Every structure is written in C-alpha cells, then in structure tokens.
Scaffold this active site. Structure first.
Site, PDB file in Angstrom:
ATOM      1  N   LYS B  72      28.887  31.485 -87.676  1.00  0.00           N
ATOM      2  CA  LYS B  72      27.912  32.441 -87.199  1.00  0.00           C
ATOM      3  C   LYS B  72      26.569  32.188 -87.903  1.00  0.00           C
ATOM      4  CE  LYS B  72      27.468  37.344 -86.520  1.00  0.00           C
ATOM      5  NZ  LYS B  72      28.179  38.661 -86.628  1.00  0.00           N
ATOM      6  N   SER B 147      28.710  41.679 -82.803  1.00  0.00           N
ATOM      7  CA  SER B 147      27.611  40.699 -82.828  1.00  0.00           C
ATOM      8  C   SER B 147      28.045  39.225 -82.890  1.00  0.00           C
ATOM      9  CB  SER B 147      26.618  41.034 -83.952  1.00  0.00           C
ATOM     10  OG  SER B 147      27.257  41.055 -85.223  1.00  0.00           O
ATOM     11  N   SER B 171      32.355  43.655 -85.595  1.00  0.00           N
ATOM     12  CA  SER B 171      31.660  42.479 -85.035  1.00  0.00           C
ATOM     13  C   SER B 171      32.472  41.204 -84.943  1.00  0.00           C
ATOM     14  CB  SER B 171      30.350  42.193 -85.760  1.00  0.00           C
ATOM     15  OG  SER B 171      29.301  42.896 -85.125  1.00  0.00           O
TER      16      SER B 171
END
Ligand SMILES: NC(=O)CC[C@H](N)C(=O)O
Ligand SMILES: [Mg+2]
Ligand SMILES: [Zn+2]
Lengths: 91, 478, 410
Positions: B72, B147, B171
């Site tokens: 990420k 996210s 997330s």
C-alpha cells in the site's frame, strides 16, 4: 454552523479555503457534527480514558545512532541552500 | 499457470529450482498487463525493478524467497515514491524503509509495486485516491472498498499473490470482503507502525491480504514482532502462525452480538452470513448470543478519535522539508495554507477541520476525551463477552460492493460502510475478513473478531472455512 | 516606593545528554547544518518518537534538586503550532500531568536575608530548530530540533530585578552541580522569558501581566526588568492602564518595546501523544536518584565553613564557581593548609588567570603546584615577596614552584 466558524478552524489548520469549499464544508460539517453527537447519553464520569495496556514505559539508552545522510535528508526539499531548508522569510 | 499458483506451490517450485524468482515476477507481471487497464490497482508498478532485484536473489531457504508482494502506498519503500495517493506527496521519494518492508526484503520477498488507496487512507471505496479510482475485478462498475483498495484488488485478480494494507477502521477487512479475498488486521501493537504514514496512531495497523490462509499467516509472521523504532509495538513473541493455522481446536465458541440484529443488513448479506454460521454449527462450533451494550456507539466514537489524531498527524505536510509546495505565496502563512489546501483532497480536508475542532480547548472534554472514555466502555463490552465466547462473528459489511459515486454525495454515507469494522480498532483487537459466499456475482465477507493476541484462532477458523468453501478458486477477469 | 513588582520566569534548560529526546541523533553545538538529523526529528512521514532514558533520569534529578514533588505518572502531550523550525507541526511536551510540581529555590540576598522562590512546574519537552535570516528567505537548521529541554516555571514570587538575576544564577548553579546541564545562556543552553506585573504595596490582587521574550544574558534580564518596572509605574501614575502584551528588549538601548505585529496566540489543541504511553516513574528509581544525588551548592557552602574553617565570604566564592571549589579541595588534599591555600588562590592565582583570560579548569598552575608553593611559604623556604614573584612566573610558564626556585636560586 457559521461561515465565521469554518474560516476560524481553517486558519488554525492552515488551509486557505477556496470559496466553493467554504459553502460545501458548512453543510457537510454541520451534518457530521449532528451525525456524531450521540455520546452525551452515556455516563462517563468514573470512566478512565482508553490507553493500551503496558507494564513499564518503553525507553531507550542515551547512545548515538547514525544520522540520515544530509543528501537524503534534503533531496525532497522544495528549496535548499548550503545545507539549509529554504523558506520565505519569517519575522 | 504460475500466477495462478499459491505460495506453497510457488515455494516448492523455487526451492527445487524448477522455477526462478525472475519467472515468478514475469508471470505476475503478465497478469498485471492483462488486468491493470481495467483494475488500476497500482500507483507505482515496480515489476521492472523487481525483475532486476530477482537476478541477485539466491538463497532459496528464505521464508518468502521469490514471492512478489504488493504494498500500500502509505508504507515507505526506500528509493521509490510514497504518495499516500496525495498531491501533497507525489514526487516524495522515500528516504528509508518502513520496518515491515525491511523485514520482507530480509525474507526474500520482492516488492512489486505501490498500491492505490484513498488519500492518506481515509475512505471506504478508494474513490478518494487523488490520482484515479481502483475498480472491483468482479464488477468494474463497483468499488473494491477502501482504503486499501488496490491491495485487495491486485490480490483478487492475482496480479500479486499476497499484499500489505493498513487498517484504521476496517481498511483491510472491508476491501477483503468486497474483493472476495482474505484480509487480516492483527492486534494493535503486533506490527510496527514505523514507516507507516500515520493516520490515527492509536488505531492504525499494517495487515495482510491473501487468498489462502497459509499465505496470509506467513506474511503476517514475517512482518510482526517488536520494533525498537516503535514505542507502541508490543514486546510479545510472534507465534509460529504458519505451523498453527493447520491445527484444530475443539469446542470453540462464537458470539453473535444481540445489538448487531438491529443493524440494517442487505438480505443477500444476511442470508450469506446465516449460512456461514449454520455451516460452522454443523462443524461443531457452539453458537451463542452475546451482549455488547455499547457497540452501537462505535461509529461516533471512531469519527471523533480518527479525525482528531489525523489533524495532528497531518500537521507536518507544510511545504518546508519535503513534498508539494504551492507556487504562489506572499508570506510563510500563505505558503502553508495554500500548499495544504491545494495538496490535500476533500475527505482529508474534512477530517482535518473536524479534528482540530475536537481537540480545541472548550470542546476537547466533550469530544476527544469523551470518545476515549466511551472507547474504554466498548473495549470492556468485548473483554466481558470474551469471557463466555472465543470469537465474535458478524458480516464484515452491511452491504454488497456498491457503485462508484453512490456514497460521495453525503460524506456520511461513506462512513456508514464501517459500522461493523470500527469496533475492532477501538478495542485494539485482531479481526479477519474471509469470503463466505457470492451473491448476485459479488463477494460477501464474514468477520471474526478475536481476543488480544489471538490471531491464531482467527487464522485457524479461516483455514477450516476455506476447506469447506474454496474461494481461492474464484478468479475474476478470466 | 508605593508599588511592588510581581515577577515570574519561564526557563528552558537544555539537558546535557549525548542524544536527542526522541531519537538517537547527537546533541552537539555548532555542527554543519542539518547533519545530526533523522526521519524522526525531521518530522518525516511514518517516523515515531522514542523516549531518552537519561533525559528522564536527568529531569528527575533536576526536580528533586529543586525540591519538587515528582509524580510517578506523567504524560507527553502534543502542543500544536505551525513554524518552520518545528518539523511535526507539534512540539511534544507535558501539560496537565507534568513530571514535577510544588518546589522551591532559596535565594541569598545581598543584605543578609534568605528568600524563597517557588517552582510551579518542571516538565520534559523537546526543542525546535534554529532559523537564520538571509535576504528574502529563512534558512532552517534542524540540528537542534528534538533536543531535550526541562521547562521550569516559577510562581510570581520574585520581587526585584536583582532577585531575578540572583534566581537565574542559583538555578544555573544547581543545574551545574546536579550535573544535568551546562546551563550557559551564551550557548543557548538556557533561555528565559519574563513575566511582570506591578501592584500597590501590600495588596493581594495581581496587576496586568507583560511578557518579555528573548533576553539573552542574566545581566540583560536585570536590565530589561529594571526598565520595565519603571515603564509600568510611569503608566499607572500618569493615570493610564498597563496593557497586556509581549515585548522585546534591545541590549543596545536598554529599553523594552511593543511589537508591530498584533498576532494573538492560537489554541495549542493539547492532547496525549498517541505515539507514546504515559511516563511511569517507579518510586524505587526516585529513591535511587535521591540517594545518589551529587552535592548541591547550599550543602557545599555549610560543609566548607565546617570542614575547612572558611569564612562565608570565602566559601561563597568557591561555591558560586564550582570549579574554583574543586581546585581548592584538590589542593588542600596535597597540603592540608586550608587558610593558606584560600589566601593564595583568591588573592593571587584567580586574578592572575583573569588577566591572561584563562579559566581555572585550564590553568597552568595545577592544584599540586599551589599546594606546593604555599608549603614553601609556611616552611619559610621562601618569603611572601619571593612567593609573589614565583606565582607570576608559574602562570607565565607552567613550571613547578620548586622548579623556578632552583632555576633562580632559593
Ligand atoms: C481503514 O481501516 C480506515 C477506514 C476509515 N473508514 C477511514 O476512511 O478513515
Ligand atoms: Mg516550552
Ligand atoms: Zn534524529
């Protein structure tokens, strides 16, 4: 919630809001403040605020660690000079 | 077809030289090339650089020897851009490795790219990426969640087998649910937050996506454990999860929060979840109703705490030492305020404003301090429920993957995605999302919340469930 | 005089650690800009603070030496403001729940009497960096960012400019004696902001408070105060009201000035740093620092008067400048003639070194040489007259007293 309120909070946060953002954030924030106002109902006298558990405070010996190379420390800088971060003058 | 193989299949092939690290990378690279134009999982693909790093990779007994891994783009990888999917941080080249990346590199892994996200990890759909939306590989009209959107998605299409995300209020889990993949966020303190661009320091945790429970258990074992560079990281030994997932513990108990019955669920989700539980019952799990009298308060609690810590943690993005700086300004004040208004996205700006209110003197007591108290009430519900039961189960999400633009109208509608996910972060507990059904073509996630430090049990039940239900065979995009 | 000056001080003291407060970068003076620097202390994304043990130990010792109650649980809080020399957007200090509280320093006044000034708090915090201005730009060195500071706040117990200075001198000497900081304003190891109000004599209410920031020597705080008290008395007696603000002091003019910028402070949005657990100080650790406390000035003062029969004039000199006392005692150790050694130290050596500009730590005349010289004076080997001639050359050359006696005949 006021326009005055939106500007005051923006200032503290260093956000120069564009005029479109000021109106939009008046409603959205007003709504979010209503949305989250649920907690009065609860009694929290005699409740300790949350902290993760831990037996001792984590501390570190007073021994030097190799610093970051100044080149890497400065490489991302918008403006640099003679080893210094460069910004517009402050009074 | 190689990228179609698990890490167990890949490891055995790599250890006996039948394949090389370079080929593995090439395989996933091609699959990347097949899918990426549709999916858009990555901000910065690094298959190119991984190809070169593969040539010098030699010691085969390294636990992740030849394994590609997406990361990420709020986790720092040195030498490459870490954007947090923000304008304020595009062109920020990371000067150091996050501790997890150091530990993966040392384990032989190969970082294959930097994954798309909501800007600064704030959102439930990835739409708030300042660059572009990532799309659900099971229906490109649908969001992959957020996210960690891209990290879920890329694991779903298998452009990488395994992935790192972060979980502040769901997330990892919610993306895992929406993309039909396994996703775990471990106990708060199990994985270092050194090199993790901080959102809410007291809530954030790096975690893992995978398609097989062993894949997930191994990546987690590698990245977990004490870090001296992180004060909040626990001095607790990492359990040998790779050896533990496969085991079976008798007479485990599952709690079904009574207060969750009152939660609006989509009928498809309800049906999928009921079936998940019945089938677990059949396998010998005792199923009990539990009480969490305070959970309903999780959302308002979270949306005070998170924005608060976020306004503090984002104070540093200022145009002075790194990243974006506005072009026009008459004084340092304008430099500051313009850099920030221009470099920050709207969801981010919203939580900054909210935060700096909640921390303002005069409101701190009623907002942040209050919330931190209610947070202890909620934690206590769990600790008490865990006296009777071993894991707590619910749907990961109230709905099936929703459409783009559907929750951008009122920011609140976005927050409501998190209603079943945020309680675990508040209480600092581990929580896993595993795929339980496909309903109308779309994945549905089942959630298990564990006791502090009990990722083992979460992982074990995930392993048992995949044997009954082989979700890892459902591959989207042909 | 009709009025009374109510004076409080806020002091930041730099702790003499090797390392910064929250990372392993070196603390040192005058290095190359931005070389002793980190992801942590640079306020870089993803970087986390780690508490310095010695900083904590030193801050406890400081607290005790200031007779404070040391609290077993204190909490680091985030203090928020935007400024180029402040990397994170916040300073990590303490707020509600500081390390130490309820202390006092005793002043010895020049008219014989002893007074007390209360210490309101001592908390642990980290330093910002330094700006340099050059043209239309500011250049930022973050070498100093994250350096450990003790913030020390005084109750408004000070009454006189001289007392302010005398307070600062005593604090400095405690810090130095405790061994926690060098505390010289010259190297900015000690900062001092001043708070001052006036009050009709014997009244119990407080007057309007003026703040004076960035005064840079102990002498300059006396001067700033001297003028400011007069400034405020003038205002009130002309029928005006004294207005609440911050001011600056120009050394060259010896005057205090209002500011052109009408810039109000902003809510610091304080709250516990979520990156750090509360600071938990075991009682057993306080006990241990208490037991092993170095000797402090007021204690040393009574000890010399007793152990060596010195006068209060003599002991005061040796104690106010620690290294002079240290010299004296290492000398008395070689030849147990205290009365003689203080004489030749105070009346002879000290002024000889002053004239050359050399500090007592670095004098050519070692404690052994003075003890030796005084030995020759007591044993009547040479005369006082000849002794004053050889001491001059001892400083000049570096040779032993008995070296130059022989070289020039006895
Ligand atoms: C992760 O987990 C964080 C999710 C949360 N809803 C946010 O947008 O901040
Ligand atoms: Mg201070
Ligand atoms: Zn540092």
């Amino acid at each position: 919630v006021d326009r005055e309120w939106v500007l005051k909070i923006a200032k503290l946060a260093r956000l120069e809001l564009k005029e479109e953002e000021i109106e939009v954030f008046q409603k959205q924030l007003s709504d979010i403040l209503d949305f989250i106002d649920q907690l009065k109902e609860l009694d929290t006298e005699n409740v300790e605020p949350y902290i993760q558990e831990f037996e001792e405070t984590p501390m570190r010996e007073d021994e030097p660690h190799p610093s970051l190379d100044r080149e890497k420390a400065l490489m991302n800088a918008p403006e640099r000079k003679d080893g210094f971060f460069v910004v517009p003058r402050v009074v | 077809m190689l990228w179609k193989k698990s890490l167990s299949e890949l490891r055995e092939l790599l250890k006996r030289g039948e394949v090389s690290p370079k080929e593995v990378v090439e395989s996933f690279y091609d699959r990347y090339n097949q899918t990426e134009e549709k999916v858009k999982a990555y901000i910065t693909p690094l298959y190119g650089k991984a190809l070169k790093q593969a040539e010098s990779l030699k010691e085969r007994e390294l636990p992740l020897f030849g394994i590609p891994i997406a990361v990420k783009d709020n986790i720092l990888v040195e030498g490459e851009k870490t954007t947090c999917a923000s304008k304020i941080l595009e062109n920020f080249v990371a000067p150091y490795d996050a501790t997890v990346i150091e530990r993966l590199k040392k384990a032989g892994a190969l970082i294959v790219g930097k994954t798309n996200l909501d800007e600064f990890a704030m959102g439930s759909s990835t739409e708030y990426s300042a660059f572009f939306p990532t799309k659900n590989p099971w229906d490109l009209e649908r969001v992959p969640g957020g996210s960690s959107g891209g990290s879920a998605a890329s694991v779903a299409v298998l452009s990488a087998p395994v992935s790192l995300g972060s979980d502040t209020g769901g997330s990892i889990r919610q993306p895992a649910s929406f993309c039909g993949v396994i996703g775990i966020k471990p106990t708060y303190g199990r994985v270092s937050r050194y090199g993790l661009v901080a959102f809410a320091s007291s809530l954030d945790q790096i975690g893992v996506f995978g398609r097989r429970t062993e894949d997930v258990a191994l990546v987690l074992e590698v990245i977990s454990g004490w870090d001296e560079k992180d004060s909040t990281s626990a001095k607790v030994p990492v359990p040998e999860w790779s050896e533990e997932v496969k085991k079976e513990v008798k007479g485990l108990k599952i709690g079904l929060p009574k207060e969750f019955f009152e939660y609006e669920l989509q009928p498809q989700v309800k049906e999928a979840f009921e079936n998940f539980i019945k089938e677990l019952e059949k396998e010998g799990f005792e199923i009990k109703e539990v009480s969490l009298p305070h959970v309903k308060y999780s959302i308002p609690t979270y949306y005070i705490i998170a924005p608060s810590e976020a306004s503090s943690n984002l104070a540093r993005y200022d145009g002075v030492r790194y990243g974006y700086r506005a072009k026009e300004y008459k004084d340092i004040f304008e430099m500051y305020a313009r850099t920030r208004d221009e470099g920050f996205g709207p969801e981010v700006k919203r939580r900054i404003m909210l935060g700096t209110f909640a921390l303002s003197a005069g409101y701190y007591d009623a907002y942040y301090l209050k919330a931190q108290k209610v947070r202890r009430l909620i934690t206590n519900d769990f600790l008490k429920a865990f006296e009777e039961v071993d894991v707590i189960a619910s749907p990961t999400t109230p709905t099936l993957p929703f459409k783009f633009g559907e929750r951008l109208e009122n920011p609140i509608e976005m927050y409501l995605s998190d209603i079943l996910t945020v309680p675990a972060n508040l209480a600092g507990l581990p929580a896993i999302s595993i795929p339980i059904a496909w309903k109308d073509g779309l994945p549905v996630g089942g959630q298990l919340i564990g006791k502090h430090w009990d990722e083992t049990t979460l992982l074990q039940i995930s392993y048992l469930w995949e044997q009954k239900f082989k979700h890892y065979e459902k591959i989207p995009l042909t | 005089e009709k009025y009374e000056a109510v004076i409080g001080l806020e002091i930041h003291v730099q702790m003499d650690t090797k390392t910064k407060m929250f990372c392993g970068c070196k603390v040192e003076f005058g290095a190359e800009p931005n070389t002793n620097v980190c992801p942590v202390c640079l306020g870089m994304p993803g970087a986390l603070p780690i508490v310095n043990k010695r900083a904590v130990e030193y801050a406890i010792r400081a607290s005790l030496a200031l007779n404070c109650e040391v609290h077993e649980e204190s909490v680091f809080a985030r203090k928020h403001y935007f400024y180029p020399d402040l990397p994170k957007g916040y300073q990590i200090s303490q707020y509600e729940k500081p390390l130490a509280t309820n202390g006092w320093v005793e002043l010895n006044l020049p008219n014989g009497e002893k007074k007390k000034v209360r210490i309101r708090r001592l908390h642990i915090e980290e330093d910002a960096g330094k700006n340099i201005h050059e043209g239309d730009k500011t250049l930022v060195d973050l070498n100093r960012a994250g350096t450990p500071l003790m913030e020390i706040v005084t109750e408004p117990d000070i009454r006189t400019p001289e007392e302010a200075r005398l307070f600062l001198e005593k604090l400095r000497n405690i810090m130095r004696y405790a061994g926690v900081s060098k505390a010289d304003m010259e190297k900015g190891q000690l900062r001092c902001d001043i708070n001052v109000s006036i009050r009709p004599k014997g009244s119990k209410e407080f007057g309007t408070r003026v703040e004076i920031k960035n005064v840079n020597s102990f002498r300059f705080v006396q001067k700033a105060l001297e003028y400011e008290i007069e400034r405020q008395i003038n205002v009130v007696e002309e029928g005006g009201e004294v207005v609440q603000e911050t001011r600056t002091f120009d050394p060259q003019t010896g005057k205090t000035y209002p500011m052109r910028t009408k810039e109000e402070a902003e809510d610091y949005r304080y709250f516990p740093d979520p990156d750090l657990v509360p600071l938990k100080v075991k009682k057993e650790w306080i006990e241990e620092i208490k037991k092993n406390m170095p000797e402090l000035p007021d204690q040393r003062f009574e000890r010399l008067i007793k152990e060596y029969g010195l006068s209060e004039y003599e002991a005061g000199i040796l104690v106010n400048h620690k290294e002079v006392g240290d010299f004296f005692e290492e000398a008395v150790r070689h030849f147990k003639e205290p009365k003689g050694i203080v004489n030749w130290l105070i009346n002879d050596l000290l002024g000889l070194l002053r004239d050359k500009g050399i500090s007592i730590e670095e004098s050519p005349v070692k404690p052994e040489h003075l003890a030796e010289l005084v030995k020759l004076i007591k044993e009547k080997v040479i005369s006082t007259k000849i002794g004053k001639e050889v001491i001059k050359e001892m400083v000049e050359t570096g040779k032993t007293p008995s070296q130059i006696v022989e070289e020039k005949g006895l």
